[PDB]
Every structure is written in C-alpha cells, then in structure tokens.
Amino acid sequence: VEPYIRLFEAIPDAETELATFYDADLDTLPPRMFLPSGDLYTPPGPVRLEEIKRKRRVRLVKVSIYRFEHVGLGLAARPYAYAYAWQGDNGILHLYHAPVVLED
C-alpha cells in the first residue's frame, strides 16, 4: 500500500473543483480498468472500491475484484483479486500493477 500512496501523492496538484467519484459496487457495472502498460484489464465480475487518499480530480483506491459462483448457498459474489489504483473524473481505474489473484 505505502508505495502506492507515494506514486499517487506525486501527482501534481491544481486548484479546481472537487470531483464526485464513481463509487462502483457489486450492484453496478465496473468501470473500464487499465494496467500500467495501458492495456485494458477485463474483470471476471464487478468491483468494490475503498478510497485511501484523494486530491481534487483523482483519488487513490483499493479495488476489490469479485467473481460470481453458484456454491451450496446459491449465487454468491466472491473475492477474486485486488489492485491498488487511481481513479479519475470519468470514473476510470488506472491500476498500478496487475491484480493479485486471491488464493482459495
């Protein structure tokens, strides 16, 4: 986490209005996500975001990546991966690294 706070806070600041960010959820379509190379990352399900820091027009988030499964208890959204990212005012997620896939 800390090196990602470092990268994020190094974004140069500017006097502007605060943006309202897109709080994506299990209920909503995940926004487009991109790896640090610029490649599109396609999640296997929806995401949830946890804000860590914010500036005016960008924020730092922890992105939790879910997948749906039909286990014993019926349909479940279950954690699949995570990545730190910055999000901008179009709601787009810019990943700092390829998502870490969570072991069962």
Binding site: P12, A14, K55, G88, G91
Partner: protein, 130 residues
C-alpha cells in the same frame, strides 16, 4: 541565438454526442504516458515533452457507429452512464518539443472570461524548443 517558444492550444466544446472534457482520466494510456500530467490532465511546468507526448489530456464521447453491438446493448440496458469515452488529447507534433514554461487554463462562465460559442474550457501550453 534566440529561443523559440511555441504556443499550443486545445478547446473542450459542447457536442451533440455530449461534452468534451479536459482531464487526466484517459483510457488506454500507460502510467508513463500520464507521468508528467497534473491532476487536471495539464502537463506540469518544467517537463520535457517530445513528439507524441501529451500536453493536455482530453476525452470525447464516441460517434454512433464506433461502439460494438454488445456495447450498444449495454448502453440501452444500463443507461447513458454506460458509455466509453475516447482519447482526444493534445499531443506534441512531429519534429517539435522542448520544456514546458507556462500553462494557461480558462473555463466558460468564470468572471471576465469570454470563449468561442460552444467552448466549455480552453488550455494553452508554452514550450521552449530544444
């Protein structure tokens, strides 16, 4: 030896497809490509820019026949927020470049500001050429 200072300019305007916007939040760009941009998407003073590098980030909505069929369905189903913007940024032209020495940004509706009809905002970047 006189120093050569170029004036680069980009406007974000209202459009039938929806507003263009100056921003850092641009799809399909690597971290490196976004490295020298402030949080508004405007390149930072003191930066070295080379041909193809971004001076001012901009996104626009896509034309009608651009999205895939599945992407047309998603819009109809989930609403107008389910639309993909595209990268329409101001880039350094071939054969040019240097050091950013000044930026200017103006917004429609600010006190004293008068922009062309349709223009929501305008940004200028000054680069001392090398």
């Amino acid at each position: 030896g006189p120093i050569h200072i170029e004036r680069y300019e980009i406007e974000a305007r209202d459009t039938k497809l929806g507003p263009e916007r100056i921003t850092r939040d641009i799809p399909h760009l690597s971290e490196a490509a976004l490295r020298d941009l402030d949080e508004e998407g405007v390149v930072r003073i003191g930066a070295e820019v080379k041909p193809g590098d971004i001076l001012v980030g901009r996104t626009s909505f896509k034309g009608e026949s651009e999205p895939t069929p599945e992407e047309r369905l998603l819009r109809s189903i989930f609403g107008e927020k389910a639309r993909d913007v595209k990268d329409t940024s101001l880039r350094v032209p071939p054969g040019e470049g240097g050091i950013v020495v000044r930026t200017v940004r103006l917004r429609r509706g600010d006190p004293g500001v008068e922009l062309k009809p349709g223009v929501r905002e305008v940004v200028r970047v000054y680069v001392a050429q090398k």
